[PDB]
XYZ file of C-alpha atoms in Angstrom:
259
model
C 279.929 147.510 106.707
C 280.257 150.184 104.069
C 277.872 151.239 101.198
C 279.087 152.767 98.182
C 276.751 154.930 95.751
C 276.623 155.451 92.058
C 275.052 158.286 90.449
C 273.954 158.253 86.484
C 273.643 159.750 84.208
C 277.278 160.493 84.046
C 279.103 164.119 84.416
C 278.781 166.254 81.682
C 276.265 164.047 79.465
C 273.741 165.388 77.588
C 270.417 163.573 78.234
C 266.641 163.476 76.778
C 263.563 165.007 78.105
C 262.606 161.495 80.218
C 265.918 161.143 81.863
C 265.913 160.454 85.616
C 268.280 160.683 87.903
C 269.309 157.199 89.382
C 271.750 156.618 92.498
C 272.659 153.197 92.993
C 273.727 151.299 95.888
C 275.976 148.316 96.053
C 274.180 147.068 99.572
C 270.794 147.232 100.299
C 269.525 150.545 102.148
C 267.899 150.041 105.048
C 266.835 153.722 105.712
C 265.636 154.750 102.303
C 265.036 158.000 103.767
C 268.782 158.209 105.271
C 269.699 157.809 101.862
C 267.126 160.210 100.421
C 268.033 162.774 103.026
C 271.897 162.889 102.076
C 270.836 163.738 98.087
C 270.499 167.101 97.061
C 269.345 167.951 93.393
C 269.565 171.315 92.514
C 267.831 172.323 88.864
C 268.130 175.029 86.525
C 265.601 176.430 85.486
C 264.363 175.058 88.931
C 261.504 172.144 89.176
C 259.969 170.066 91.767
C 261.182 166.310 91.958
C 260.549 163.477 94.099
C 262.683 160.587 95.192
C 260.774 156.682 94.008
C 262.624 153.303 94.942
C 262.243 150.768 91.764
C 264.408 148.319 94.244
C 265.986 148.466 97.675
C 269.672 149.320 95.861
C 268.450 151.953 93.387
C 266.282 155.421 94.178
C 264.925 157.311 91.073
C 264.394 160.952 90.902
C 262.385 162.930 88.366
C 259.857 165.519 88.150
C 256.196 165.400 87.333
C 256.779 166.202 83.569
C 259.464 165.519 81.053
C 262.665 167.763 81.708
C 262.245 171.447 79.782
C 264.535 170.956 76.983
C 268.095 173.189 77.992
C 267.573 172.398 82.024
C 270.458 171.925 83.968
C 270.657 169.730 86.482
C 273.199 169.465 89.489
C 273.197 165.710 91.906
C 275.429 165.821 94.951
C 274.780 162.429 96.917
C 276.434 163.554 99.778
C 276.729 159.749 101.681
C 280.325 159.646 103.761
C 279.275 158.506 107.196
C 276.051 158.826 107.024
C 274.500 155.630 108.613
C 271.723 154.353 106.203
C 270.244 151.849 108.725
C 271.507 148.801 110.775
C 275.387 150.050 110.945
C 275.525 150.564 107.491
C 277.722 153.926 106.615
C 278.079 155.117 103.362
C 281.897 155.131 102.026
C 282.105 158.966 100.276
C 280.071 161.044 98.652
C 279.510 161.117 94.513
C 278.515 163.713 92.322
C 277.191 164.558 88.499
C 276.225 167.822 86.301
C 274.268 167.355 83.223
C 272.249 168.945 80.833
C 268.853 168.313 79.039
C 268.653 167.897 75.534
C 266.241 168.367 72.558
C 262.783 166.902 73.124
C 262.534 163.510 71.062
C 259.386 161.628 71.700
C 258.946 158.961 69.119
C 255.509 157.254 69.040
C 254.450 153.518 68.372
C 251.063 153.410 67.076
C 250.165 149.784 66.710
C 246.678 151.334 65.288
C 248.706 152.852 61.962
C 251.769 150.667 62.486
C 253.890 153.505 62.696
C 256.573 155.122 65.182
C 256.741 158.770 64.885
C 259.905 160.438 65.794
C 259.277 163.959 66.618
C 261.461 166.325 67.865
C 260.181 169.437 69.448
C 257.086 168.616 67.982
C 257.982 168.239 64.641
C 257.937 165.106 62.592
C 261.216 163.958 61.726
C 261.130 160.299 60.988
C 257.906 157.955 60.098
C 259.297 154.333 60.077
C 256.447 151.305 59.613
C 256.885 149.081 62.299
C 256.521 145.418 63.087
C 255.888 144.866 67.142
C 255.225 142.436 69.626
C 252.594 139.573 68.004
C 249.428 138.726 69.430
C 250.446 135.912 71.988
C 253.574 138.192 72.840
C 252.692 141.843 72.474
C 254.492 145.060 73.405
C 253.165 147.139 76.454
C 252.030 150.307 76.031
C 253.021 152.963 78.000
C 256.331 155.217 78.206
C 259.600 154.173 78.067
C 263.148 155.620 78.707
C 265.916 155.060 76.108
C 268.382 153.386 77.673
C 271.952 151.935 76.184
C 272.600 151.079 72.356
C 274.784 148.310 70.340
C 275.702 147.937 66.905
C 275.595 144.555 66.799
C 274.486 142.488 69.735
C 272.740 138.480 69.618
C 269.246 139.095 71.432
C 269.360 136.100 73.828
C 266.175 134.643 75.503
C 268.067 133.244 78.032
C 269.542 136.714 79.285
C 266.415 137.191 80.771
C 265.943 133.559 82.470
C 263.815 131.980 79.266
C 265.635 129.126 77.359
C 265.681 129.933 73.637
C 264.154 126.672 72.571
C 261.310 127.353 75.288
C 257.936 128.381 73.538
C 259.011 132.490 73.906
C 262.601 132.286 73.741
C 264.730 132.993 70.612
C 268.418 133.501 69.925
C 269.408 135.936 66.648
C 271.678 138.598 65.840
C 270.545 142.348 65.379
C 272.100 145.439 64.221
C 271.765 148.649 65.772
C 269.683 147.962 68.570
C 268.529 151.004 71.210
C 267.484 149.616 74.688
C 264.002 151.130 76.234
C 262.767 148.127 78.600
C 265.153 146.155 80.999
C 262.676 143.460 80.405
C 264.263 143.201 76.844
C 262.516 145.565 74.152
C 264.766 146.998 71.704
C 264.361 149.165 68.938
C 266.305 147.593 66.096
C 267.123 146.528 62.826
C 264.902 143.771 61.329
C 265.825 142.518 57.770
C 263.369 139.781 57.878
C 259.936 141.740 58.579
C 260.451 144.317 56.726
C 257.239 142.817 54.746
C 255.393 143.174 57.839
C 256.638 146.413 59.359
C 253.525 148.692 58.591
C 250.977 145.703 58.366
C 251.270 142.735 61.311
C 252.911 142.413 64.310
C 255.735 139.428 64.464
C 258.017 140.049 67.115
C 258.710 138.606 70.767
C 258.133 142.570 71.969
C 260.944 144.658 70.283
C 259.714 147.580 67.886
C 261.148 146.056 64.425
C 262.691 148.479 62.068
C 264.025 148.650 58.526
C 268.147 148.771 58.584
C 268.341 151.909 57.609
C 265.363 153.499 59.866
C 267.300 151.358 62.878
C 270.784 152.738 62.136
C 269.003 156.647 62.315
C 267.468 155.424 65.661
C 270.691 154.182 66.938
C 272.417 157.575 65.778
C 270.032 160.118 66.443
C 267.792 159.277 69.480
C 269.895 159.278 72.839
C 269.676 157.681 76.505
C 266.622 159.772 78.157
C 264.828 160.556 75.077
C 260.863 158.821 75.510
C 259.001 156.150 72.815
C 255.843 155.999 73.921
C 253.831 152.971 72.800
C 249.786 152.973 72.070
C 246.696 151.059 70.744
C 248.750 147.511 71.358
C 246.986 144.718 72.524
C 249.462 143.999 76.074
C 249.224 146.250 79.423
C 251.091 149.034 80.322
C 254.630 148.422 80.971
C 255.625 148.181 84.685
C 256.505 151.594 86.086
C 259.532 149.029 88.422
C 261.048 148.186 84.637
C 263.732 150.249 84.943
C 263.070 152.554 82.159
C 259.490 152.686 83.192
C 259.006 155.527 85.839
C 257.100 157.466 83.654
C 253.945 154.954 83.867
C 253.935 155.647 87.594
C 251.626 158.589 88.734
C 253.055 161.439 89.933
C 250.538 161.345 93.141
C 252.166 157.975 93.668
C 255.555 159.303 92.608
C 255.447 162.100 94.677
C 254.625 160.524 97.695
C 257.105 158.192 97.252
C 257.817 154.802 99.126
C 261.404 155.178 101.880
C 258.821 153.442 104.534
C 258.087 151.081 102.059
């Protein structure tokens, strides 16, 4: 009847300004606030943080702004025999230490076509862009870089949509960086490089030239943000998984355990 927990990002890492903390559990918690309770987050320089539940196995934590570049940041999830609801105990207690990294924002501007990587505010890379067409367009909003691949076939059907259905597809990309669990990648696009400034052609992902999606890959790291604007879609669910920025921090902050 035992709960294990999993705490990311992992000990020692080095981590961009959007990273939040993310404990995992292999049941489902019952008492969010059990489970809240037993997590102590200690940050250097200190800031204020709030716990926010994007499922009932995984609790977020982050504070109201992106991390101050050089913060360090201590998680203890302190969860042997505590009982997070309905006889469920959790199995031992976890723990991480991490640091914060350089701030690298990089901007999608569907208006110029453009995504703007800046680090601590300074231009650094302006690669033309190619995003999500009309019929299938990228959200707007902020996103969390999450894993990368070198190579990797971008599947449809990963993500429960045949590939011969009307918005599935099935092709092989290089250097691909992760910032939506609902599938958009930054990565290399051979075939629109004609269109990367000038129209939008892709099922979502933020096409790239090779050699502009091989410096992505190499230089921008889990936790650093790409914030998207002026695209014809919605704003990209704050429940993504690398969405929590697009949640307010009132709502944030008062968080959802009873929920």
């Amino acid at each position: 009847h035992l709960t294990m927990p999993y705490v990311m990002p992992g000990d020692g890492e080095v981590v961009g300004v959007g990273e939040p903390v993310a404990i995992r559990f292999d049941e489902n918690i019952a008492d969010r606030g059990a489970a809240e309770k037993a997590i102590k987050i200690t940050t250097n320089p200190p800031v204020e943080g709030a716990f926010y539940w994007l499922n009932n196995r995984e609790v977020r934590w982050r504070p109201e702004h992106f991390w101050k570049p050089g913060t360090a940041v201590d998680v203890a999830v302190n969860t042997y025999g505590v009982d997070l609801g309905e006889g469920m105990f959790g199995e031992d207690n976890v723990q991480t230490h991490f640091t914060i990294g350089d701030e690298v924002i990089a901007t999608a501007d569907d208006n110029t076509k453009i995504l703007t990587v800046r680090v601590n505010g300074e231009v650094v890379k302006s690669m033309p862009t190619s995003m999500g067409k009309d019929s299938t367009p990228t959200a707007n909003g902020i996103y969390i870089v999450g894993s990368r691949y070198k190579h990797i076939i971008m599947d449809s059907s990963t993500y429960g949509v045949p590939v011969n259905s009307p918005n599935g597809y099935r092709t092989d990309v290089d250097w691909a960086t992760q910032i939506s669990y609902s599938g958009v990648f930054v990565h290399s696009a051979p075939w629109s490089v004609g269109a990367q400034g000038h129209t939008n052609t892709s099922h979502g992902c933020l096409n790239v030239s090779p050699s502009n999606a091989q410096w992505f890959y190499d230089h921008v790291k889990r936790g650093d943000i790409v914030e998207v604007v002026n695209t014809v879609g919605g704003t990209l669910p704050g429940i993504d998984g690398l969405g929590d920025w697009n949640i307010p921090w009132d709502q944030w902050r008062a968080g959802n355990a009873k929920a």
